[PDB]
Amino acid sequence: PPTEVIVRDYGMPHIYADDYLFYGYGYVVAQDRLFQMEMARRSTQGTVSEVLGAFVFDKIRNYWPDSIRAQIASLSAEDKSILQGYADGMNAWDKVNASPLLPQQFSTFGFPKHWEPFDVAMIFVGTMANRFSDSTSEDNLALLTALKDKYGKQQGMAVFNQLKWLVNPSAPTTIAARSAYPLKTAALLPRYDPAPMLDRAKGTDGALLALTADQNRETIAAQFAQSGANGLAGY
């Protein structure tokens, strides 16, 4: 039958279908991770405080959803089927709402709803793109401003190059040097008189702390000072 679509192994599902395959995917995910996936949807879209109250973090809303809407709208029918099917798969597993199958966590936390292709896309874009491919601290200008106020304009900029070097030819590289990278304005900038990196804090369990703006800054400072890029305030 053409309309037919699941086998499981340690619990790992395998999906069999002959076309909109991702419905199977969406289905098994909503069985295994419905709560985790719902709280990724709220996190990537900044709706966490709708159910959790300390998270007004929500102000995530670091992107332009109409861009992503429009990208989805201009997809080929086949590309769109991935997103449409995954969403419909998730929605079908309606069964939780018919027989609350409801993960305990929903009860504990006190609220699931259906999905769209946007939500699905947003799970990727909220994580891989808006979070992990978006690493900047150009915090750098505040460091530069202070460096110049201590050493002077010229020597400040020389010390900035000592701490955040532009390139370093002694660095180990995955591609051995035997190809190389062929591509081989700071004095036009105003002053930056608190570094934004201080307005990002999480506790030891990894939860958001709900501190005051002052306190938060003091905390971020304190833990970065202790643990660095690989600590609670790292990146």
Binding site: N161, T173, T174, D205, L208, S227
Partner: protein, 549 residues
């Protein structure tokens, strides 16, 4: 969001290729990644993928692939303004949307501003508005790129999907015939000459990006002569400039050497020895190799009864691997505690001293200190340590020492001063006999909160593991054309705590809520099945839906 990989082509034993991937996004409950197999409609894949993306960030289709964090500068900040909501680009041009936030037990509003360069991060009124991602407008395409590459059966069909992937991500390639590859993928901006990428630029017109650098410029290698491709978020390639993140550097001090030194100690690797690297790197102290020459010769002239030498002799007699004792709360050797002390003192005297307060807090970290629940992600050489390392190298470093970190004094004097600090603080804590020192071992946790700090499970569901291990959130291995057996490809992985996160209203946990959690701790692994026989032969359940449409 960091993480490691070693693909092995000439270097494989009893196979044609071995891909071992270990992405590091932190440890969570339920597991960060999700196992899935997809069969039909063009696909024929098995693997595991973060947040159950339609695309399998780690898998194989009978070629294999994986990813680490690229960390390229694909984002720049345009410094745009007391005509509100207008910016000058010789003319006064902002886009705004209004957002209201619903709140459960409280009261509901703000605006977000976008320029032609992008979203406005911050407005400094005393001066300016800062707003640019090389990948803007290509996010969904990047998703569908990760999906379509699953259907690729050779290097060309693969790379043309890599070139549609716009985010800064290392991709990796291996295939049945022993071919391996690497593409530091991503969209990147074609900048004006003079554009310093570490700092904002004016957004008045003259500094706009020209467009995007060609995919021809994205670092690539295919069947390199070393017979392998190793990475732990290090430089893809010579003269390749890093992301502008102040805490991020590609210097002479790099943890990927710890991988490289292993992959050169012997001519070939079995699938077992390749997997055994996760163990080795996991427990490897990352700073001993960097600073031990300097400590060795700074104390060469001291007597043995001198604590500062005693410490260094202890480090000199250490193989640089941390193993936790049976009590489960201490390390067999005090090496890391020693180096943590020394390194902390050294940074306080050098890099930090040279930086105006409060910015010295950016360079204070020795890269060891962590809270009770253990590290949030991987462990690395810290930005302070790396800078210090360049200064310890002196004229062997290509980096110009604008300010001397050693304050006119010789290295050996500052080194010895920090050892004296280290000894004072360590002799107070664990006492005056070094051979009795029981230093705290680092623990590991599967936090109930996702990386955003938002809960994805009940506080109770957090799982503990006595031994922190510097390794992938998950680990997967693919082995191609194994000499023994009937299968062309053999795959393994480990999704701890388990595949399921389900707890029934009565609080009954699913069978597969926790069954990989001891497996992870012991460097074990389960098999990944691809073929319809293998799948059916190991079926535990089977459901058939009719989907209309």
């Amino acid at each position: 969001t960091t993480g490691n990989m070693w693909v092995i082509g000439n270097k494989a034993q009893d196979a044609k290729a071995i891909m071992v991937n270990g992405p590091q996004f932190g440890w969570y409950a339920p597991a960060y990644t999700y196992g899935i197999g997809l069969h039909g409609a063009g696909y024929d894949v098995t693997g595991n993928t973060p947040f159950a993306y339609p695309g399998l960030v780690f898998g194989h289709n009978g070629i294999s692939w994986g990813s680490t964090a690229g960390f390229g500068d694909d984002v720049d900040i345009f410094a745009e303004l007391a005509k509100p909501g207008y910016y000058q680009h010789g003319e006064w041009v902002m886009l705004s949307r209004k957002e209201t936030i619903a709140v459960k037990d409280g009261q509901p509003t703000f605006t977000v501003w976008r320029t032609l360069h992008g979203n406005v991060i911050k407005t400094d009124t005393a001066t300016t508005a800062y707003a640019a991602r090389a990948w803007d407008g290509k996010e969904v395409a990047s998703l569908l790129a990760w999906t379509h590459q699953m259907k690729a059966k050779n290097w060309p069909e693969w790379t043309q999907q890599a070139a549609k992937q716009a985010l800064t991500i290392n991709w990796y390639y291996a295939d049945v015939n022993g071919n391996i590859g690497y593409v530091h993928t991503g969209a990147y901006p074609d900048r004006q000459p003079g554009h310093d990428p570490r700092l904002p630029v004016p957004g008045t017109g003259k500094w706009d990006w020209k467009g995007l650098l060609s995919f021809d410029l994205n670092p690539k290698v295919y069947n390199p002569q070393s017979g392998y491709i190793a990475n732990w978020n290090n430089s893809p390639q010579k003269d390749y400039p890093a992301s502008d993140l102040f805490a991020f550097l590609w210097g002479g001090a790099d943890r990927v050497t710890e991988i490289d030194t292993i992959l050169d100690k012997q001519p070939r690797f079995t699938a077992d020895q390749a997997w055994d690297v996760i163990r080795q790197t996991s427990r490897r102290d990352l700073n001993l190799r960097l600073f031990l020459p300097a400590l060795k010769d700074a104390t060469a002239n001291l007597a043995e009864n001198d604590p500062r030498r005693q410490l260094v002799d202890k480090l000199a007699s250490w193989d640089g691997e941390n193993l936790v004792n049976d009590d489960g709360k201490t390390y067999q050797q005090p090496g890391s505690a020693i180096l943590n002390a020394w390194l902390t003192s050294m940074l306080k005297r050098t890099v930090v001293a040279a930086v105006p307060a409060p910015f010295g807090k950016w360079y204070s970290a020795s890269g060891y200190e962590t809270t009770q629940d253990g590290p949030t992600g991987s462990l690395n050489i810290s930005v302070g340590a790396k800078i210090l390392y360049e200064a310890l190298q002196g004229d062997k470093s290509p980096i110009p020492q604008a300010v001397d970190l050693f304050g006119g004094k010789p290295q050996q004097e500052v080194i010895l001063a920090a050892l004296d600090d280290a000894w004072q603080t360590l002799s107070k804590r664990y006492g005056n006999d070094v051979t009795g020192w029981k230093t705290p071992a680092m623990a590991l946790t599967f936090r109930a909160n996702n990386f955003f700090g938002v809960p994805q499970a009940a506080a109770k569901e957090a799982r503990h593991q006595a031994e922190y291990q510097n390794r992938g959130t998950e680990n997967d291995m693919i082995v191609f054309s194994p000499t023994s057996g009937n299968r062309p490809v053999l795959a393994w992985d480990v999704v701890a705590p388990g595949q399921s996160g389900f707890i029934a209203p009565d609080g009954k946990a699913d069978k597969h809520y926790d069954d990989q959690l001891k497996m992870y701790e012991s460097f074990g692994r389960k098999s990944l099945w691809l073929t319809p026989q293998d799948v059916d032969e190991h079926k535990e359940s089977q459901e058939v839906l009719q989907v209309q449409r």
